[PDB]
């Protein structure tokens, strides 16, 4: 089935130019120890960038006293005692905010899609309280979701994530949301020393819930959500707060709870920045999209491409990236590396040669077949001549 691109309906439209470092979308700072203005000042190269607006809060805000005590475990609600709450209007979101205000702890997760978007888009957000599960349309509510900062940056309310390492970045980038009061069960599992540290492992073992493999590979932009996708999304957070109870208590017992909160604070402090503006020195502290050695080299060796073609290979890499940025698509939607490898290996020099490649071609390659053939012809002419 055809899925229209939801970015088209975004209020602020998508900018892949990377003209300037990432600017936090945050316009209000609840639960502040430091003025937002003082947070929003740019930093000089040392590259230039904005700092984490809640950095001070994460470092110096005090955890809720409840997280500190051994406390008996509160089981997850019976799956069938309730329906997941679908949140896609301004109103439903506001009602949800009021509910979240009344918790001491909540479970959060997201679904992210990167095939039909250059950087990616957050398609769903899952939030569970002790009582209910919420499923939030982050496509339709992109420009509204910031109000959750009231609860997400409230340090007296624990936010439970399993492996928040990327989700922290994505909350920032798309919804302008930050987390103060994070507990990451991934780090908890690690400190405990469990044989596995996946959500799947925890769900099977503390919740007896069997996950089907491959649904986070599904296309989460589609509306409405399929019933299995609804359930698997709900499942991500439905069970997590109990898991937190059990892991927290053992951490308290094992003398390792302080260590997990530190790790969780390091996860929370993670900042979203563009790859051009990435840090000079490698760090788990910052994530940027690209930060490595030139991927064409593997691809030439892998498809056994003659050594003379680095520039052809590199030229295709640049075009694909530029075109992906222009049309707001992943590079693999534009042209999988394997198709790229096919173009370089077989060097078709006319439209028919490009399109009739044994691989078959993508929509972008069909549309730009003449350009691609010209790009290739020049390399063949230039390889001979030069």
UniProtKB/Swiss-Prot annotation:
Residues 306-386 form the HRDC domain. Zn(2+) binds at residues 109, 111, 236. Changing residue 232 to F: Temperature-sensitive mutant. Abolishes exonuclease activity and increases accumulation of 5.8S + 30 nt RNA, 5' ETS RNA and U24 + 3 nt RNA. No effect on subcellular localization. The keyword Translocase does not apply. Its EC number is 3.1.13.-. Mn(2+) 2 binds at residues 111, 236. It is found in: Nucleus, Nucleolus; Nucleus. Mn(2+) 1 binds at residues 109, 167. It is an enzyme of class 3 (hydrolase). GO terms for biological process: exonucleolytic trimming to generate mature 3'-end of 5.8S rRNA from tricistronic rRNA transcript (SSU-rRNA, 5.8S rRNA, LSU-rRNA); histone mRNA catabolic process; nuclear mRNA surveillance; nuclear polyadenylation-dependent antisense transcript catabolic process; nuclear polyadenylation-dependent CUT catabolic process; nuclear polyadenylation-dependent mRNA catabolic process; nuclear polyadenylation-dependent rRNA catabolic process; nuclear polyadenylation-dependent snoRNA catabolic process. GO terms for cellular component: exosome (RNase complex); nuclear exosome (RNase complex); nucleolus; nucleus. Belongs to the exosome component 10/RRP6 family. Component of the RNA exosome complex. Specifically part of the catalytically inactive RNA exosome core complex (Exo-9) which may associate with the catalytic subunits RRP6 and DIS3 in cytoplasmic- and nuclear-specific RNA exosome complex forms. Exo-9 is formed by a hexameric base ring of RNase PH domain-containing subunits and a cap ring consisting of CSL4, RRP4 and RRP40. RRP6 specifically is part of the nuclear form of the RNA exosome complex; the association appears to be mediated by Exo-9 and not by DIS3. Interacts with LRP1. Interacts with NPL3, NOP53 and PAP1. This is Exosome complex exonuclease RRP6. It comes from Saccharomyces cerevisiae (strain ATCC 204508 / S288c) (Baker's yeast). The chain holds residues 127 to 515 of 733 of the full protein.
